Structure formats: structure tokens, C-alpha cells
Structure 1
Amino acid sequence: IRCFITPDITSKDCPNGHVCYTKTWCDAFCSIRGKRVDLGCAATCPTVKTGVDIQCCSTDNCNPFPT
């Protein structure tokens, strides 16, 4: 069977990477639910789409899900 999967958030080695990042943006219900979150890794801090904020950092696992 083929299904949609929501894989668990986990920590991964990005051998070519030098920063971790946290992208945040507002969806339809941002007022009550808060900003959406995307966590990743990259060689350099990536440029983002319109309406997206990004925070980059340079220690392992420096991008936990925001509290």
C-alpha cells in the first residue's frame, strides 16, 4: 500500500552542512495556533520565500522545535 507518512522529527548528520536552521511562517490560523515550523540543515543559511523567517545556528542540534 502507498500512504502519506509524517516521519518522526529526529536528528540527522548532514556531512556537508555547516548550519542548522529553523524556518517559521504564518498559515491561515497563525493568530491562535502560532507559526508553522520547518527544521533542517544546509551548507549556508538558505534564502527563504516571502513571509518566511529563518534562524540559523552553528552547533549540533541548535534548532530544536520552538517553545
Structure 2
Amino acid sequence: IVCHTTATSPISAVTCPPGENLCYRKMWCDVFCSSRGKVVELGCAATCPSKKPYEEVTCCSTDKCNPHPKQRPG
């Protein structure tokens, strides 16, 4: 499975490693939310990352299904 990742700048797509079969997207507000919007974290995962009261995490199993919120998935 190919996943988008914020581990690189610019954001890139990578073949997720053995064991990591899900692509995920985490977003949350920090002090700059009102102007820059939520922080965006994208990557690979074996299992969906725990969500917090202030975290928004979504998981999926299709190629590049976790794009930056402003870009089309796939």
C-alpha cells in the first residue's frame, strides 16, 4: 500500500513498510489554528493511531487515501 507522508518536505508518497498496511491522517489545532488551519500529519501505520480529545485521526486502506486535506486522494 502506498501512503502520503509528512515525514518529507515537500509531502511525498511512499510504499508503506512490512506490517504497515494502513495510511492515516491526523489533524489538530495548535495556537495558529485560526489562521493556518489544523496541523496535518500523514503516514503509514500497522494499526490506527490512538485519537485524543484534541486529535482527529482517520485511517484507510487504498493507495494515497490520506492526502493533505486540500488535495484529492488517490
TM-score by length of structure 2 reads 0.72
Which is strand-richer, 1 or 2?
Answer: 1
What are structure 2's unaligned runs of at least 5 residues? 1-7
Corresponding residue number in structure 1 for 2:42:
39
CA RMSD of aligned residues (A): 1.6
Distance 2:36 2:68 in 1: 14
Post-superposition offset of 1:50:
4.5
Give aligned-pair identity as a percent: 56
Is 1:57 matched up with 2:54?
Answer: no
**Structure 1: 4+ residue segments shifted above 2 A:** none
**TM-score normalised over the length of structure 1:** 0.79
Unmatched segments (≥5 aa) in structure 1:
1-5
Larger radius of gyration: 1
CA offsets 1:1-30 (integer angstroms, 9 cap, x no match): xxxxx6321111123212100000001021
